[PDB]
Design brief:
Keywords: Calcium, Hydrolase, Metal-binding, Metalloprotease, Protease, Secreted, Signal, Zinc, Zymogen. It is found in: Secreted. This protein has about 325 residues and is of the alpha+beta class. It contains 8 helices and 15 strands. The chain folds into 2 domains: about 150 residues, Elastase, domain 1, CATH 3.10.170.10; about 160 residues, Neutral Protease Domain 2 (Neutral Protease, domain 2, Orthogonal Bundle), CATH 1.10.390. A hairpin with a 1-residue loop joins strand 2 and strand 3. Bound molecules: ligand 8LB, calcium ion (CA) (4 copies) and zinc ion.
Length: about 325
């Protein structure tokens, strides 16, 4: 909408106060004009018709319980935009400052979030498996990263290419969580998963097997559930990424860690310069090796560590 840029204040899903960029035109709308061609947050009103209505508020204060998922979807989309722009020189998901749109309060009891080809969508959860999923910064960045993937490598959402697609979203979701630097970890979704159980998460990158996901190619899932295991076999790539950054010895193979920033540079370059819609795990290894060679040189520790990490998870 046309209006003037304003700054509201509200509380997110976890009860924390934050400022949010809004737009005033009769109402105050969740429309942040400070980033690209805007970040826009919509109310789906417990229905499944998208996007719903651009979020309107009478007083620019967003402290109601119903407001909390919108505050966080809007704010964390801004953090994710900032990460891509400041760290990777990428302007929104398409590289051309496309408007970023999210809807919250999608459906009833909906235990998921997704990119639908055009926008982000967040359930409220059922209060048992999830609370409203935009409360997780890694979740928000996971969803926006699907849009980045779709505009770049275009990884098809099935089998190995789909597991790479998933791992890319978990990797950058985690790197955005570290960028914001509030309780960062290598776990996925811990801030919104299972409110009655402490210390768990939906997936772990440091130890995928903790939640039944493979940590070695020999343990890959080859059935048809979950689009051929896209959220399962992602554990193999997530583990490799964790090892590249943090190091470790895994199935007897030692990896020298090179840190998060270099991990992000290598995988961003792989995603945007080398991967294709049909890339498999072996082709990802090659893309990561070439990316690290471009950035750091063929004789670098960074290249050697990429090779070590893929060896450790059984990907040649
Ligand atoms: C980070 C977590 C909290 C959310 C994440 N969701 P996602 O991977 O973005 C889902 N996207 C997807 O299915 O895209 C395909 C698509 C859809 C519409 C239009 C076009 C294309 C996820 O891990 N979901 C799991 C766990 C769900 C909880 C158990 C899962 O679905 O099995
Ligand atoms: Ca209000
Ligand atoms: Ca965390
Ligand atoms: Ca996390
Ligand atoms: Ca929990
Ligand atoms: Zn995903």
């Amino acid at each position: 909408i046309t209006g003037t840029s304003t700054v509201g204040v509200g509380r997110g899903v976890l009860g924390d106060q934050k400022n949010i960029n809004t737009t005033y035109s009769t109402y105050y709308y969740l429309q942040d004009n400070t980033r690209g061609n805007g970040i826009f947050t919509y109310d789906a009103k417990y229905r499944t018709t998208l996007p719903g209505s651009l979020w309107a508020d009478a007083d620019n204060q967003f402290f109601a319980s119903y407001d909390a998922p919108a505050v966080d979807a809007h704010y964390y989309a801004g953090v994710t935009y900032d990460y891509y722009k400041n760290v990777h020189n990428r302007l929104s998901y398409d590289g051309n400052n496309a408007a970023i749109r999210s809807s919250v309060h999608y459906s009833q009891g909906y235990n998921n979030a997704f990119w639908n080809g055009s926008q982000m969508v967040y359930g409220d959860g059922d209060g048992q498996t999830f609370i409203p999923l935009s409360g997780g910064i890694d979740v928000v960045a996971h969803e926006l990263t699907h849009a980045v993937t779709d505009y770049t490598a275009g990884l098809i959402y099935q089998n190995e290419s789909g597991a790479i697609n998933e791992a890319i979203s978990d990797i950058f979701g985690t790197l955005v969580e570290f960028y914001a630097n509030k309780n960062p970890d290598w776990e996925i979704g811990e801030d919104v998963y299972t409110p009655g159980i402490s210390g768990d998460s939906l997936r772990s990158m440091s130890d995928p097997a903790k939640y039944g996901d493979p940590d070695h190619y020999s343990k890959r899932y080859t059935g048809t559930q979950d689009n051929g295991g896209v959220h399962i076999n992602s554990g193999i790539i997530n583990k490799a990424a964790y090892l590249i950054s943090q190091g470790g010895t895994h199935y007897g193979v030692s990896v020298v860690g090179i840190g998060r920033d270099k991990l992000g540079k290598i995988f961003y370059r792989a995603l945007t310069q080398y991967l294709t819609p049909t890339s498999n795990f072996s082709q990802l290894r090659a893309a990561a090796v070439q990316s690290a060679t471009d950035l750091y040189g063929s004789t670098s520790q960074e290249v050697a560590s990429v090779k070590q990490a893929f060896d450790a998870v059984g990907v040649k």
